[PDB]
Amino acid sequence: DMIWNEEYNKMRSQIVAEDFSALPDMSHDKIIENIEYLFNIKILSKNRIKEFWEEFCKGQKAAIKYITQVHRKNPNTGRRNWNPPEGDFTDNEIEKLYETAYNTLLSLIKYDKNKVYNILINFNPKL
Amino acid sequence: KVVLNINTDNMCNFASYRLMPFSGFIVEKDRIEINDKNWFDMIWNEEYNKMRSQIVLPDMSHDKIIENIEYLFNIKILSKNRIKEFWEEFCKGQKAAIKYITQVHRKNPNTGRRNWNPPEGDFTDNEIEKLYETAYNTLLSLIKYDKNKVYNILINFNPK
Amino acid sequence: AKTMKKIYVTMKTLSPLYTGEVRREDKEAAQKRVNFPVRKTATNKVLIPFKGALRSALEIMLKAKGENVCDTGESRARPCGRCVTCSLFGSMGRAGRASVDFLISNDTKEQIVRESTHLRIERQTKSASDTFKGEEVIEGATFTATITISNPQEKDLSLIQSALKFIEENGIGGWLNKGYGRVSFEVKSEDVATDRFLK
Amino acid sequence: AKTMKKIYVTMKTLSPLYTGEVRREDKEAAQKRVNFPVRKTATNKVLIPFKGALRSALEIMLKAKGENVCDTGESRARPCGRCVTCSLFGSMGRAGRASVDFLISNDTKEQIVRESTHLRIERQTKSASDTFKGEEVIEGATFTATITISNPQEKDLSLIQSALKFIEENGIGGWLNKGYGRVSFEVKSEDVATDRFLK
Amino acid sequence: AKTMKKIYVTMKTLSPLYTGEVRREDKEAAQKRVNFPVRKTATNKVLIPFKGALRSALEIMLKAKGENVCDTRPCGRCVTCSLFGSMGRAGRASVDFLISNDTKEQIVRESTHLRIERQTKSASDTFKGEEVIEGATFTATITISNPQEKDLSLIQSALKFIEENGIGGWLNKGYGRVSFEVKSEDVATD
Amino acid sequence: IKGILESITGFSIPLDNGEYALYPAGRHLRGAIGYIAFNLDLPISSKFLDFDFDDIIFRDLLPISKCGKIFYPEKNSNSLKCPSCNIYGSSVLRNIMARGLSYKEVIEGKKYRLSIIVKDEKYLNEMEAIIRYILSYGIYLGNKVSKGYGKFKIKEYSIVDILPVKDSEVLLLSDAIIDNGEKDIVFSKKEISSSKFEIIRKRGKAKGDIIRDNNHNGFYIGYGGLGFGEIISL
Ligand SMILES: [Zn+2]
Ligand SMILES: [Zn+2]
Ligand SMILES: [Zn+2]
Secondary structure, X not given: OHXXXXXXXXXXXXXXXXXXXXXXXXXXXXXXXXXXXXXXOOOOOHHHHHHHHHHHHOOXXXXXXXXXXXOOOOOOOOOOOOOOOOOOOOHHHHHHXXXXXXXXXXXXOOOOHHHHHHHHOOOOOOO | OOOEOOOOOOOEEEOOEEEOOOOOEEEEOOOEEEEOHHHHHHHHHHHHHHHOOOOOOOOOOHHHHHHHHHHHXXXXXXXXXXXXXXXXXXXXXXXXXXXXXXXXXXXXXXXXXXXXXXXXXXXXXXHHHHHHHHHHHHHHHHHOOOHHHHHHHHOOOOOO | OOEEEEEEEEEXXXXXXXXXXOEHHHHHHHOOOOOEOEOEOXXXXXXXXXXXXXXXXXXXXXXXXXXXXXXXXXXXXXXXXXXXXXXXXEOOOOEOOEEEOXXXXXXXXXXXXXXXXXXXXXXXXOOEEEEEEEOEEOOOOEEXXXXXXXXXXXXXXXXXXXXXXXXXXXXXXXXXOOOOOOEEEEEEEEEXXXXXXXX | OOEEEEEEEEEEEOOOEEOEOOEHHHHHHHOOOOOEOEOEOOOOOEOOOOHHHHHHHHHHHHHXXXXXXXXXXXXXXXXXXXXXXXXXXXXXXXXXOEEEOOOEEOXXXXXXXXXXXXXXXXXXXXXXXXXXXXXXXXXXXXXXXXXXXXXXXXXXXXXXXXXXXXXXXXXXXXXXXXXXXXXXEEEEEEEEEHHHOOO | OOOEEEEEEEXXXXXXXXXXXXXXXXXXXXXXXXXXOEOEOOOOOEOOOOHHHHHHHHHHHHHHHOOOOOXXXXXXXXXXXXXXXXXXXXXXXXXXXXXXXXXXHHHEEEEEEEEEOOOOOOEEEEEEEEEEOOOOEEEEEEEEOOOOOOOHHHHHHHHHHHHHHOOOEOOOOOOOOEEEEEEOOEEOOO | OEEEEEEOOOEOOEOOOOOEOOOOOHHHHHHHHHHHHHHOOOOOHHHHHOOOOOOEEEOOXXXXXXXXXXXXXXXXXXXXXXXXXOOEOOOOEXXXXXXXXXXEEEOOOOEEEOOEEEOOOOOHHHHHHHHHHHHHHOEEOOOOHHHOOOEEEEEEEEOOOOOOOOOOEXXXXXXXXXXXXXXXXXXXXXXXXXXXXXXXXXXXEOOOOEEEOOOOOOOOOOOOOOOOOOEEEO
């Protein structure tokens, strides 16, 4: 029973949602500017951009799901799953930068794959 | 039409019924087919490689170039593999070679590692960083030359 | 060449032990549940890299002693080839004579690997600011390795045993600073002849 | 000449296996993701050179015992014809009596090959100075080779089995000093007339 | 002569295959890079000597089963002399080369081979050879004139012997292990 | 019968003094086709056994060029150049050392002319059958026929009428046979099912020379036929 529960949890881990199978707009220049700003204050990090591209290549729905998972302010703790920003910031700027990351990733969700791949090599060359 | 692509070998006998714990995937198509994880790993890799399918000059003296590349070949920064790689880049244009020296000389923001080979010897850290710099200037000036002179100059240090 | 040293190493954990998953696929399959999985076999048995631990131990003590022993720990550092740890563990032109096996556990994950909850506590509020879940090998778990020394010298047993005492002191695997990896080693050495397998 | 000896060698990997890619195009296509590719087929199945390991095992043990065996591993070392290794595995003149197949895996690279993180740790800093990726074969992977022997002698099976015990002890493939390549061998031997395929 | 047999033999490589490049100018042109180039056409398809391999297979098999088969200096009275030719009389089995279906760039891969010292466990010698990958299907059309009754059986027996031993070169290292598919036919009329 | 033959496996035809000719000659074509007609018991076999028959004229296979036309021979040389387009020769011979045996072989992939001529209705069905055989299952020229050297499949087959050269000013397309000739032309005539071999060595005139001769000898024919000498309108 224990190995069956562990294996069955491993099964649903797989085939989640629609892998490899309602979005804001902002200019391409704006998207490079926002990802370039959040790269250097350690919010949109290289691990974040990697798992962005992994959830994007399985479809737009998985990328929306992962972005809503990271940006979700948990009502018990008040902690989003973003990497905290580096530097002197007050709380309101910290949530505004998190909302900036939200809007930037959800707006590049609408773009095509070669307009994302070419925007995340100059931050992650091992995408 | 239910087609079993699970191996029907290695099956135990319990309660006068043969049985084998399975763990795989059901696939709709005429056929309701039973595939294992290997099949899903193959299909996952095929669709992932179907999504990754869409993937789009300070000229100094010639004597300076030779003297610099002699020193860097002796102190083991500019080795045979890097000379061969630079020759393949210069053999695909100069802009490619610009990108290659940019990639090797790119100090990582976090680690402070440049992809050159550490100089063999006992040099100080500022000397090591200036040695990486003159590797950059020496190679970058060698991109400004033409194919014949770059060829004869690199074959003294990499015979291939 | 007519004789070979064989050091059978039997290690037992005195503290919880962590070394990390290194295969990207097993790390991904385990990071849906466990943020820090142990390095495991496909036969569900824990592996612990051993050659780097012994080599690092011998370079720290032989550099503290004062012998001309090179450092292979620096970034892309070339081994010299003329020192003790280059003879034992290796150089550029010569492979190391001490073939050091992996520390294969005697038991299996369901008997030795236990999931674990780690915390990060805010220093002003005393509240769990963060937590994570890492797998860890229990205390009393027994691991077996074999060090096979070809063309042995006199000092090789003393060198391996001293390096094992250093690993007993300092730890093996990861998270050595917070208390993980403290082990004991038992050594059964035996000199064999290289023609033993020939009938 | 009227008899051939078939030795079916099946091999189970006990500690993870590395055997590097030889093909320049396949390795360079794998250099984007992997620094140390494993030797794969075009049919996605891992191959391991087996005749060199058997010949090296036999020459090490037979040089240790004290037969008149040569060493075909030095730079310009001509193998003679007057050996039992040179009779089984060949010389510059007469060909090898034992044809040793590649150790081709029973499973595909999706099932048994895993991309891996390997480290180089500084000794004093105790931090990861270098990181790279290498593909390794999982433990429990089964590899099948067949060795035919034309004109068998009597001690040929014993010599092949002794070399397999030596490879069980030492390892096959690469990274043998750091724990990789420890394998187990099982031999199913038979004698067949060379007219087995005639009707 | 009113009956003629065309044995259509396809091959797929199971092990990596090497047969040596045979022409001196293309060997020397490839010897700057490759110490053992593979046998290639000018249209960049791999050519494989097939007659000698089938012949050799019949001589060891029929020497083992006890037939009066010469060892290749032919005899002229053996059935391998009737199949693949004596010095006076020609061969009934005209054997084509085993041409590749695909091109050099798709099936030929440069590769590294070593020679390893047995006391230092390090690479003493290093060289490069070109090999044909596995799954590369090859075809040939063996023609047997004046077909005797046991020709296809002898040819398939040799073909299974080649699957047992290998074709090309480096056969004791494991190279050349192949699988064979045969489709026969007869030829008459206009 | 105009046609294009493509070589996928190369050919090796030798000459004396350690030379190998650039192009496959029509004597080799003839010998291959007469063997092939033997293997199919075609009614013309006995005539290919005879070296004199001149009704069917198997001309020489001449290398076609990028132009698409037929390369033409050049006097006092070892090469052919499309008068239409500036050369075939001494760069397609390739030296081969194979398990002791050293020879030379002309590289594959080049396209050659398959122009035969048939002066009677007695063979149109027979040739048809031979070109059909050459189409489905190929033809072989040169040495090592049973080792697969000399593979030659058709690429084009057109039955197009032919007319003699209405000019007494004719250039020798191939090696003609004359009584007092300077180039010794050597060929052979085997006899299968009789075990007979002979090397026919006859003097004659070389190719690429203009002949001012009012004879005109039908269509080409220099005197041997069966290959031998050809001519073209200058
Ligand atoms: Zn050292
Ligand atoms: Zn010897
Ligand atoms: Zn014979």
